[PDB]
Amino acid sequence: EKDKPVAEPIPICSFCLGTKEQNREKKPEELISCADCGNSGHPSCLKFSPELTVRVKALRWQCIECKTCSSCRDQGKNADNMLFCDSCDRGFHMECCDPPLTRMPKGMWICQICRP
């Protein structure tokens, strides 16, 4: 993440078509932008909590479609079942977790990086 360059951000929310000056509640709200494709969303349109929003703004964040597994760097045939960390929004295939997961976790899920 420290190494891969960041795409030019699009200053429009892909979900509501507002800018940083107007979200769905007619209020200003800064965008977050995918580092790989540049497409953007308001945290409120992405349904991110304030805490998750703070963490992803400090990371090389990827949108839902661009998200690659932090362990294997792939999307692959099992991409749709990639888990998204509820602390940092990184993606992990279940088979790439440490330890590997046979089944979907229940409730909020925290990845191997965020776990103390």
Binding site: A79, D80, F84, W109
Partner: peptide, 25 residues
């Protein structure tokens, strides 16, 4: 937990791209 698939659904649809293009320029 969220997966790519469930996050697509729970987030809600993207706006029509033609409308995002009309706005992007």
């Amino acid at each position: 937990a969220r997966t790519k698939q469930t996050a697509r659904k729970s987030t809600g649809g993207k706006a029509p791209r033609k409308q995002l293009a009309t706005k992007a320029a």
